[PDB]
C-alpha cells in the first residue's frame, strides 16, 4: 500500500474505454472494477483505490453515476487522476509452515478463522476480512478453489491484501459473481 497521494495520467482506448467502474462510499469515490488489459490496469489502478480528483476536479460527494458521466465527457486525449492507494486495505506478510499452510480458513474470499500457532496468528491476521490480493494479484470474484490454488503456487512468503468485510460488501454492491469472476483484472502485473 503506498502512503499518500499519486497522480496517474490515462488515455481512453480506441473504443473510448478506460476499464473502470467507480463506487460512491462515505462521500468518496472508489475503484469497484478494473478491466484486464485496459488503460486503468496498465497505469496500475487497483480495486479499492480512492479517486480524489479527475482533471483537477474534486470527486468528494459525487454519485457513482456522476463520476461515470465525468469520465464519459472527458477529452480522451489525456485524463489526469489523483489517487489514494487502497486506503481501506492492509497487507499482511506470512510464511507457510512445513505442510505449506499460512494458517487460516476462508469462505467466499472472507477469512472465517485463524489456526493456533500459525504464521497467520503470529502476524495477527483477522477474521471478517475479505482477501483482495495475494502477492499483488487481484483475486476478487475467483472461486474459493482458485484462491486456494494461487496460495498453493506461491513460495513460502505470502503477502495478502485484506479489507474489512463490511466495507468490502458495500463496495461490491451491484455486480454479480460472473463480472467479478470473468472481467475483474486478475492478471499478474506487467513490467
Amino acid at each position: 500500500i503506498k502512503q499518500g497521494i499519486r497522480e496517474v495520467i490515462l488515455c481512453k482506448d480506441q473504443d473510448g474505454k478506460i476499464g473502470l467502474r467507480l463506487k460512491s462510499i462515505d462521500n468518496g469515490i472508489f475503484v469497484q472494477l478494473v478491466q484486464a488489459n485496459s488503460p486503468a490496469s496498465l497505469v496500475g489502478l487497483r480495486f479499492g483505490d480512492q479517486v480524489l480528483q479527475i482533471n483537477g476536479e474534486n470527486c468528494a460527494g459525487w454519485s457513482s453515476d456522476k463520476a461515470h458521466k465525468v469520465l464519459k465527457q472527458a477529452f480522451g486525449e489525456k485524463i489526469t487522476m489523483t489517487i489514494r492507494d487502497r486506503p481501506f486495505e492492509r497487507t499482511i506478510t506470512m510464511h507457510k509452515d512445513s505442510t505449506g499452510h499460512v494458517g487460516f480458513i476462508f469462505k467466499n474470499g472472507k477469512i472465517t478463522s485463524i489456526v493456533k500457532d500459525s504464521s497467520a496468528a503470529r502476524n495477527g491476521l483477522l477474521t471478517e476480512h475479505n482477501i483482495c490480493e495475494i502477492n499483488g494479484q487481484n483475486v476478487i470474484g475467483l472461486k474459493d478453489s482458485q484462491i486456494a490454488d494461487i496460495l498453493s503456487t506461491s513460495g513460502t512468503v505470502v503477502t495478502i491484501t485484506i479489507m474489512p468485510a463490511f466495507i468490502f460488501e458495500h463496495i461490491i454492491k451491484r455486480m454479480a459473481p460472473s463480472i467479478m469472476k470473468s472481467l475483474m483484472d486478475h492478471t499478474i502485473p506487467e513490467v
Side-chain angles (χ1 to χ4, degrees), residues 46-77:
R46 297 174 275 294
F47 179 78
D49 279 348
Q50 192 184 342
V51 190
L52 294 196
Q53 278 101 45
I54 304 169
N55 299 322
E57 269 205 73
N58 301 311
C59 304
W62 287 4
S63 67
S64 324
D65 281 336
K66 175 161 162 175
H68 290 159
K69 203 146 195 221
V70 162
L71 286 179
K72 182 132 196 175
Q73 295 177 226
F75 305 154
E77 167 50 27

PDB file of all heavy atoms in Angstrom, residues 46-77:
ATOM      1  N   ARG A  46      -6.025   0.075  -9.069  1.00  0.00           N
ATOM      2  CA  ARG A  46      -6.367  -1.166  -8.354  1.00  0.00           C
ATOM      3  C   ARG A  46      -7.727  -1.028  -7.727  1.00  0.00           C
ATOM      4  O   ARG A  46      -8.154   0.128  -7.276  1.00  0.00           O
ATOM      5  CB  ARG A  46      -5.317  -1.629  -7.363  1.00  0.00           C
ATOM      6  CG  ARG A  46      -3.970  -1.984  -7.976  1.00  0.00           C
ATOM      7  CD  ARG A  46      -2.793  -2.325  -7.046  1.00  0.00           C
ATOM      8  NE  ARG A  46      -1.981  -1.238  -6.496  1.00  0.00           N
ATOM      9  CZ  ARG A  46      -1.170  -0.372  -7.153  1.00  0.00           C
ATOM     10  NH1 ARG A  46      -1.006  -0.402  -8.473  1.00  0.00           N
ATOM     11  NH2 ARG A  46      -0.518   0.554  -6.461  1.00  0.00           N
ATOM     12  N   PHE A  47      -8.359  -2.186  -7.626  1.00  0.00           N
ATOM     13  CA  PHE A  47      -9.545  -2.389  -6.765  1.00  0.00           C
ATOM     14  C   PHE A  47      -9.294  -1.688  -5.405  1.00  0.00           C
ATOM     15  O   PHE A  47      -8.263  -1.919  -4.716  1.00  0.00           O
ATOM     16  CB  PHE A  47      -9.850  -3.831  -6.383  1.00  0.00           C
ATOM     17  CG  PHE A  47     -11.053  -4.016  -5.480  1.00  0.00           C
ATOM     18  CD1 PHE A  47     -12.336  -3.961  -6.023  1.00  0.00           C
ATOM     19  CD2 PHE A  47     -10.953  -4.202  -4.105  1.00  0.00           C
ATOM     20  CE1 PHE A  47     -13.472  -4.113  -5.250  1.00  0.00           C
ATOM     21  CE2 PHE A  47     -12.093  -4.366  -3.320  1.00  0.00           C
ATOM     22  CZ  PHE A  47     -13.360  -4.332  -3.889  1.00  0.00           C
ATOM     23  N   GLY A  48     -10.277  -0.930  -4.960  1.00  0.00           N
ATOM     24  CA  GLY A  48     -10.157  -0.221  -3.654  1.00  0.00           C
ATOM     25  C   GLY A  48      -9.458   1.111  -3.675  1.00  0.00           C
ATOM     26  O   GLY A  48      -9.539   1.792  -2.630  1.00  0.00           O
ATOM     27  N   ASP A  49      -8.842   1.547  -4.762  1.00  0.00           N
ATOM     28  CA  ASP A  49      -8.110   2.840  -4.815  1.00  0.00           C
ATOM     29  C   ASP A  49      -9.191   3.921  -4.634  1.00  0.00           C
ATOM     30  O   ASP A  49     -10.336   3.766  -5.089  1.00  0.00           O
ATOM     31  CB  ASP A  49      -7.316   3.016  -6.116  1.00  0.00           C
ATOM     32  CG  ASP A  49      -5.978   2.321  -6.139  1.00  0.00           C
ATOM     33  OD1 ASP A  49      -5.537   1.891  -5.099  1.00  0.00           O
ATOM     34  OD2 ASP A  49      -5.387   2.227  -7.218  1.00  0.00           O
ATOM     35  N   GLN A  50      -8.820   5.023  -4.018  1.00  0.00           N
ATOM     36  CA  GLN A  50      -9.751   6.147  -3.909  1.00  0.00           C
ATOM     37  C   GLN A  50      -9.446   7.151  -5.009  1.00  0.00           C
ATOM     38  O   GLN A  50      -8.276   7.612  -5.121  1.00  0.00           O
ATOM     39  CB  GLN A  50      -9.582   6.809  -2.540  1.00  0.00           C
ATOM     40  CG  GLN A  50     -10.708   7.786  -2.254  1.00  0.00           C
ATOM     41  CD  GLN A  50     -10.502   8.506  -0.956  1.00  0.00           C
ATOM     42  OE1 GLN A  50      -9.716   8.088  -0.089  1.00  0.00           O
ATOM     43  NE2 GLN A  50     -11.268   9.574  -0.803  1.00  0.00           N
ATOM     44  N   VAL A  51     -10.477   7.647  -5.680  1.00  0.00           N
ATOM     45  CA  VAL A  51     -10.304   8.781  -6.637  1.00  0.00           C
ATOM     46  C   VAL A  51     -10.604  10.121  -5.943  1.00  0.00           C
ATOM     47  O   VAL A  51     -11.800  10.395  -5.676  1.00  0.00           O
ATOM     48  CB  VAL A  51     -11.107   8.543  -7.916  1.00  0.00           C
ATOM     49  CG1 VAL A  51     -10.764   9.555  -8.984  1.00  0.00           C
ATOM     50  CG2 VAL A  51     -10.879   7.138  -8.425  1.00  0.00           C
ATOM     51  N   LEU A  52      -9.544  10.873  -5.667  1.00  0.00           N
ATOM     52  CA  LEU A  52      -9.554  12.217  -5.029  1.00  0.00           C
ATOM     53  C   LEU A  52      -9.946  13.264  -6.070  1.00  0.00           C
ATOM     54  O   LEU A  52     -10.819  14.077  -5.775  1.00  0.00           O
ATOM     55  CB  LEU A  52      -8.179  12.563  -4.481  1.00  0.00           C
ATOM     56  CG  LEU A  52      -7.719  11.673  -3.333  1.00  0.00           C
ATOM     57  CD1 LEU A  52      -6.549  12.280  -2.585  1.00  0.00           C
ATOM     58  CD2 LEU A  52      -8.850  11.432  -2.404  1.00  0.00           C
ATOM     59  N   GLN A  53      -9.274  13.246  -7.214  1.00  0.00           N
ATOM     60  CA  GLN A  53      -9.589  14.189  -8.325  1.00  0.00           C
ATOM     61  C   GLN A  53      -9.598  13.460  -9.669  1.00  0.00           C
ATOM     62  O   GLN A  53      -8.873  12.457  -9.780  1.00  0.00           O
ATOM     63  CB  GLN A  53      -8.560  15.313  -8.426  1.00  0.00           C
ATOM     64  CG  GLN A  53      -8.829  16.439  -7.453  1.00  0.00           C
ATOM     65  CD  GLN A  53      -7.885  16.253  -6.316  1.00  0.00           C
ATOM     66  OE1 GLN A  53      -6.695  15.988  -6.535  1.00  0.00           O
ATOM     67  NE2 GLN A  53      -8.422  16.342  -5.104  1.00  0.00           N
ATOM     68  N   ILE A  54     -10.363  14.022 -10.605  1.00  0.00           N
ATOM     69  CA  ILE A  54     -10.309  13.760 -12.077  1.00  0.00           C
ATOM     70  C   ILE A  54     -10.145  15.105 -12.791  1.00  0.00           C
ATOM     71  O   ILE A  54     -10.996  15.957 -12.575  1.00  0.00           O
ATOM     72  CB  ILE A  54     -11.571  13.017 -12.531  1.00  0.00           C
ATOM     73  CG1 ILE A  54     -11.820  11.706 -11.773  1.00  0.00           C
ATOM     74  CG2 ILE A  54     -11.559  12.766 -14.023  1.00  0.00           C
ATOM     75  CD1 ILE A  54     -13.187  11.090 -12.028  1.00  0.00           C
ATOM     76  N   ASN A  55      -9.061  15.271 -13.565  1.00  0.00           N
ATOM     77  CA  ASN A  55      -8.690  16.524 -14.273  1.00  0.00           C
ATOM     78  C   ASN A  55      -8.819  17.723 -13.320  1.00  0.00           C
ATOM     79  O   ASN A  55      -9.398  18.710 -13.726  1.00  0.00           O
ATOM     80  CB  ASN A  55      -9.490  16.664 -15.571  1.00  0.00           C
ATOM     81  CG  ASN A  55      -9.210  15.522 -16.533  1.00  0.00           C
ATOM     82  OD1 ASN A  55      -8.081  15.053 -16.662  1.00  0.00           O
ATOM     83  ND2 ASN A  55     -10.236  15.027 -17.192  1.00  0.00           N
ATOM     84  N   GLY A  56      -8.337  17.592 -12.078  1.00  0.00           N
ATOM     85  CA  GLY A  56      -8.214  18.666 -11.065  1.00  0.00           C
ATOM     86  C   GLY A  56      -9.521  18.996 -10.379  1.00  0.00           C
ATOM     87  O   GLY A  56      -9.488  19.881  -9.525  1.00  0.00           O
ATOM     88  N   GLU A  57     -10.610  18.304 -10.717  1.00  0.00           N
ATOM     89  CA  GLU A  57     -11.960  18.429 -10.109  1.00  0.00           C
ATOM     90  C   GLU A  57     -12.098  17.427  -8.939  1.00  0.00           C
ATOM     91  O   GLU A  57     -11.946  16.202  -9.175  1.00  0.00           O
ATOM     92  CB  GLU A  57     -13.070  18.070 -11.089  1.00  0.00           C
ATOM     93  CG  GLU A  57     -13.660  19.208 -11.923  1.00  0.00           C
ATOM     94  CD  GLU A  57     -15.085  18.899 -12.389  1.00  0.00           C
ATOM     95  OE1 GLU A  57     -15.997  18.942 -11.540  1.00  0.00           O
ATOM     96  OE2 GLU A  57     -15.301  18.592 -13.583  1.00  0.00           O
ATOM     97  N   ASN A  58     -12.437  17.904  -7.745  1.00  0.00           N
ATOM     98  CA  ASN A  58     -12.583  17.049  -6.539  1.00  0.00           C
ATOM     99  C   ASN A  58     -13.780  16.138  -6.735  1.00  0.00           C
ATOM    100  O   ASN A  58     -14.832  16.622  -7.110  1.00  0.00           O
ATOM    101  CB  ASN A  58     -12.775  17.862  -5.255  1.00  0.00           C
ATOM    102  CG  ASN A  58     -11.624  18.798  -5.001  1.00  0.00           C
ATOM    103  OD1 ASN A  58     -10.436  18.405  -5.061  1.00  0.00           O
ATOM    104  ND2 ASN A  58     -11.974  20.023  -4.621  1.00  0.00           N
ATOM    105  N   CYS A  59     -13.619  14.863  -6.417  1.00  0.00           N
ATOM    106  CA  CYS A  59     -14.670  13.831  -6.502  1.00  0.00           C
ATOM    107  C   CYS A  59     -15.521  13.840  -5.235  1.00  0.00           C
ATOM    108  O   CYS A  59     -16.573  13.123  -5.233  1.00  0.00           O
ATOM    109  CB  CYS A  59     -14.076  12.444  -6.756  1.00  0.00           C
ATOM    110  SG  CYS A  59     -13.030  12.331  -8.235  1.00  0.00           S
ATOM    111  N   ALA A  60     -15.142  14.581  -4.167  1.00  0.00           N
ATOM    112  CA  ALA A  60     -15.877  14.489  -2.889  1.00  0.00           C
ATOM    113  C   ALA A  60     -17.365  14.640  -3.173  1.00  0.00           C
ATOM    114  O   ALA A  60     -17.737  15.582  -3.930  1.00  0.00           O
ATOM    115  CB  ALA A  60     -15.420  15.525  -1.887  1.00  0.00           C
ATOM    116  N   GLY A  61     -18.171  13.739  -2.630  1.00  0.00           N
ATOM    117  CA  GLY A  61     -19.624  13.830  -2.701  1.00  0.00           C
ATOM    118  C   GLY A  61     -20.225  13.416  -4.043  1.00  0.00           C
ATOM    119  O   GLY A  61     -21.433  13.331  -4.089  1.00  0.00           O
ATOM    120  N   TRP A  62     -19.447  13.072  -5.068  1.00  0.00           N
ATOM    121  CA  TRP A  62     -20.020  12.638  -6.378  1.00  0.00           C
ATOM    122  C   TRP A  62     -20.812  11.350  -6.204  1.00  0.00           C
ATOM    123  O   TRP A  62     -20.304  10.468  -5.526  1.00  0.00           O
ATOM    124  CB  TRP A  62     -18.930  12.430  -7.420  1.00  0.00           C
ATOM    125  CG  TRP A  62     -18.360  13.714  -7.917  1.00  0.00           C
ATOM    126  CD1 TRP A  62     -18.674  14.961  -7.485  1.00  0.00           C
ATOM    127  CD2 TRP A  62     -17.390  13.879  -8.954  1.00  0.00           C
ATOM    128  NE1 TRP A  62     -17.941  15.900  -8.161  1.00  0.00           N
ATOM    129  CE2 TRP A  62     -17.141  15.265  -9.069  1.00  0.00           C
ATOM    130  CE3 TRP A  62     -16.694  12.995  -9.785  1.00  0.00           C
ATOM    131  CZ2 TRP A  62     -16.218  15.785  -9.977  1.00  0.00           C
ATOM    132  CZ3 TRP A  62     -15.782  13.512 -10.681  1.00  0.00           C
ATOM    133  CH2 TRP A  62     -15.561  14.885 -10.791  1.00  0.00           C
ATOM    134  N   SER A  63     -21.964  11.228  -6.874  1.00  0.00           N
ATOM    135  CA  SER A  63     -22.633   9.926  -7.149  1.00  0.00           C
ATOM    136  C   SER A  63     -21.706   9.108  -8.054  1.00  0.00           C
ATOM    137  O   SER A  63     -20.817   9.737  -8.754  1.00  0.00           O
ATOM    138  CB  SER A  63     -24.037  10.070  -7.786  1.00  0.00           C
ATOM    139  OG  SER A  63     -23.929  10.612  -9.094  1.00  0.00           O
ATOM    140  N   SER A  64     -21.790   7.789  -7.952  1.00  0.00           N
ATOM    141  CA  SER A  64     -21.186   6.831  -8.924  1.00  0.00           C
ATOM    142  C   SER A  64     -21.648   7.225 -10.336  1.00  0.00           C
ATOM    143  O   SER A  64     -20.792   7.384 -11.227  1.00  0.00           O
ATOM    144  CB  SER A  64     -21.532   5.388  -8.619  1.00  0.00           C
ATOM    145  OG  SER A  64     -21.604   5.137  -7.208  1.00  0.00           O
ATOM    146  N   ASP A  65     -22.948   7.467 -10.540  1.00  0.00           N
ATOM    147  CA  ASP A  65     -23.473   7.891 -11.876  1.00  0.00           C
ATOM    148  C   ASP A  65     -22.685   9.141 -12.309  1.00  0.00           C
ATOM    149  O   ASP A  65     -22.161   9.165 -13.424  1.00  0.00           O
ATOM    150  CB  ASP A  65     -24.983   8.135 -11.830  1.00  0.00           C
ATOM    151  CG  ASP A  65     -25.795   6.852 -11.876  1.00  0.00           C
ATOM    152  OD1 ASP A  65     -25.265   5.847 -12.390  1.00  0.00           O
ATOM    153  OD2 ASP A  65     -26.953   6.865 -11.418  1.00  0.00           O
ATOM    154  N   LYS A  66     -22.512  10.137 -11.429  1.00  0.00           N
ATOM    155  CA  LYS A  66     -21.801  11.379 -11.850  1.00  0.00           C
ATOM    156  C   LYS A  66     -20.319  11.139 -12.205  1.00  0.00           C
ATOM    157  O   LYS A  66     -19.822  11.853 -13.085  1.00  0.00           O
ATOM    158  CB  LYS A  66     -21.857  12.484 -10.792  1.00  0.00           C
ATOM    159  CG  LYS A  66     -21.030  13.701 -11.195  1.00  0.00           C
ATOM    160  CD  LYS A  66     -21.381  14.957 -10.473  1.00  0.00           C
ATOM    161  CE  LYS A  66     -20.259  15.950 -10.622  1.00  0.00           C
ATOM    162  NZ  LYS A  66     -20.618  17.244 -10.018  1.00  0.00           N
ATOM    163  N   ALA A  67     -19.581  10.273 -11.497  1.00  0.00           N
ATOM    164  CA  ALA A  67     -18.144  10.031 -11.802  1.00  0.00           C
ATOM    165  C   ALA A  67     -18.028   9.386 -13.190  1.00  0.00           C
ATOM    166  O   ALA A  67     -17.127   9.790 -13.965  1.00  0.00           O
ATOM    167  CB  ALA A  67     -17.538   9.162 -10.734  1.00  0.00           C
ATOM    168  N   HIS A  68     -18.951   8.467 -13.478  1.00  0.00           N
ATOM    169  CA  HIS A  68     -19.087   7.738 -14.785  1.00  0.00           C
ATOM    170  C   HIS A  68     -19.345   8.724 -15.940  1.00  0.00           C
ATOM    171  O   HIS A  68     -18.763   8.545 -17.028  1.00  0.00           O
ATOM    172  CB  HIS A  68     -20.155   6.642 -14.654  1.00  0.00           C
ATOM    173  CG  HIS A  68     -19.709   5.502 -13.780  1.00  0.00           C
ATOM    174  ND1 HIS A  68     -20.591   4.621 -13.171  1.00  0.00           N
ATOM    175  CD2 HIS A  68     -18.466   5.100 -13.392  1.00  0.00           C
ATOM    176  CE1 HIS A  68     -19.918   3.675 -12.538  1.00  0.00           C
ATOM    177  NE2 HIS A  68     -18.610   3.975 -12.618  1.00  0.00           N
ATOM    178  N   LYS A  69     -20.156   9.752 -15.683  1.00  0.00           N
ATOM    179  CA  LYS A  69     -20.565  10.793 -16.646  1.00  0.00           C
ATOM    180  C   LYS A  69     -19.391  11.738 -16.888  1.00  0.00           C
ATOM    181  O   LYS A  69     -19.222  12.213 -18.012  1.00  0.00           O
ATOM    182  CB  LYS A  69     -21.762  11.540 -16.052  1.00  0.00           C
ATOM    183  CG  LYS A  69     -22.658  12.261 -17.047  1.00  0.00           C
ATOM    184  CD  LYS A  69     -24.100  12.268 -16.636  1.00  0.00           C
ATOM    185  CE  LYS A  69     -25.027  12.662 -17.772  1.00  0.00           C
ATOM    186  NZ  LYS A  69     -26.113  13.573 -17.316  1.00  0.00           N
ATOM    187  N   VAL A  70     -18.623  12.051 -15.850  1.00  0.00           N
ATOM    188  CA  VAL A  70     -17.458  12.963 -15.982  1.00  0.00           C
ATOM    189  C   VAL A  70     -16.377  12.284 -16.837  1.00  0.00           C
ATOM    190  O   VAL A  70     -15.792  12.989 -17.684  1.00  0.00           O
ATOM    191  CB  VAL A  70     -16.932  13.403 -14.602  1.00  0.00           C
ATOM    192  CG1 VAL A  70     -15.528  13.957 -14.674  1.00  0.00           C
ATOM    193  CG2 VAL A  70     -17.878  14.411 -13.976  1.00  0.00           C
ATOM    194  N   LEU A  71     -16.097  10.996 -16.595  1.00  0.00           N
ATOM    195  CA  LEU A  71     -15.142  10.180 -17.405  1.00  0.00           C
ATOM    196  C   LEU A  71     -15.605  10.096 -18.887  1.00  0.00           C
ATOM    197  O   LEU A  71     -14.729  10.119 -19.806  1.00  0.00           O
ATOM    198  CB  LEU A  71     -15.073   8.784 -16.784  1.00  0.00           C
ATOM    199  CG  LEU A  71     -14.302   8.671 -15.459  1.00  0.00           C
ATOM    200  CD1 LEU A  71     -14.348   7.238 -14.968  1.00  0.00           C
ATOM    201  CD2 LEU A  71     -12.869   9.110 -15.651  1.00  0.00           C
ATOM    202  N   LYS A  72     -16.919  10.026 -19.119  1.00  0.00           N
ATOM    203  CA  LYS A  72     -17.531   9.998 -20.481  1.00  0.00           C
ATOM    204  C   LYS A  72     -17.212  11.310 -21.210  1.00  0.00           C
ATOM    205  O   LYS A  72     -16.639  11.240 -22.316  1.00  0.00           O
ATOM    206  CB  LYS A  72     -19.032   9.727 -20.399  1.00  0.00           C
ATOM    207  CG  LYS A  72     -19.726   9.646 -21.754  1.00  0.00           C
ATOM    208  CD  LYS A  72     -20.639   8.441 -21.924  1.00  0.00           C
ATOM    209  CE  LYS A  72     -21.002   8.177 -23.374  1.00  0.00           C
ATOM    210  NZ  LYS A  72     -21.801   6.936 -23.513  1.00  0.00           N
ATOM    211  N   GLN A  73     -17.514  12.454 -20.597  1.00  0.00           N
ATOM    212  CA  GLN A  73     -17.435  13.790 -21.237  1.00  0.00           C
ATOM    213  C   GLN A  73     -15.975  14.244 -21.399  1.00  0.00           C
ATOM    214  O   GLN A  73     -15.771  15.261 -22.059  1.00  0.00           O
ATOM    215  CB  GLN A  73     -18.260  14.802 -20.437  1.00  0.00           C
ATOM    216  CG  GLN A  73     -19.757  14.514 -20.425  1.00  0.00           C
ATOM    217  CD  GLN A  73     -20.530  15.499 -19.570  1.00  0.00           C
ATOM    218  OE1 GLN A  73     -21.388  15.118 -18.777  1.00  0.00           O
ATOM    219  NE2 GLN A  73     -20.245  16.788 -19.723  1.00  0.00           N
ATOM    220  N   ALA A  74     -14.995  13.550 -20.806  1.00  0.00           N
ATOM    221  CA  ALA A  74     -13.574  13.982 -20.760  1.00  0.00           C
ATOM    222  C   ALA A  74     -12.921  13.840 -22.147  1.00  0.00           C
ATOM    223  O   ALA A  74     -13.102  12.784 -22.752  1.00  0.00           O
ATOM    224  CB  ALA A  74     -12.822  13.160 -19.742  1.00  0.00           C
ATOM    225  N   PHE A  75     -12.114  14.813 -22.588  1.00  0.00           N
ATOM    226  CA  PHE A  75     -11.252  14.655 -23.793  1.00  0.00           C
ATOM    227  C   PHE A  75     -10.405  13.377 -23.599  1.00  0.00           C
ATOM    228  O   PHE A  75      -9.580  13.332 -22.658  1.00  0.00           O
ATOM    229  CB  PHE A  75     -10.414  15.914 -24.065  1.00  0.00           C
ATOM    230  CG  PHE A  75     -11.187  17.212 -24.189  1.00  0.00           C
ATOM    231  CD1 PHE A  75     -10.573  18.431 -23.907  1.00  0.00           C
ATOM    232  CD2 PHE A  75     -12.513  17.238 -24.605  1.00  0.00           C
ATOM    233  CE1 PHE A  75     -11.265  19.632 -24.012  1.00  0.00           C
ATOM    234  CE2 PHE A  75     -13.203  18.439 -24.707  1.00  0.00           C
ATOM    235  CZ  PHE A  75     -12.578  19.632 -24.413  1.00  0.00           C
ATOM    236  N   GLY A  76     -10.649  12.341 -24.414  1.00  0.00           N
ATOM    237  CA  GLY A  76      -9.971  11.025 -24.343  1.00  0.00           C
ATOM    238  C   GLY A  76      -8.460  11.163 -24.218  1.00  0.00           C
ATOM    239  O   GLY A  76      -7.905  10.574 -23.287  1.00  0.00           O
ATOM    240  N   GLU A  77      -7.855  11.850 -25.201  1.00  0.00           N
ATOM    241  CA  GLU A  77      -6.562  12.609 -25.179  1.00  0.00           C
ATOM    242  C   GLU A  77      -5.694  12.193 -23.967  1.00  0.00           C
ATOM    243  O   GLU A  77      -4.729  11.380 -24.120  1.00  0.00           O
ATOM    244  CB  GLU A  77      -6.946  14.105 -25.253  1.00  0.00           C
ATOM    245  CG  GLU A  77      -5.840  15.107 -24.945  1.00  0.00           C
ATOM    246  CD  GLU A  77      -4.520  14.909 -25.683  1.00  0.00           C
ATOM    247  OE1 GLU A  77      -4.536  14.343 -26.795  1.00  0.00           O
ATOM    248  OE2 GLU A  77      -3.469  15.325 -25.141  1.00  0.00           O
TER     249      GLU A  77
END
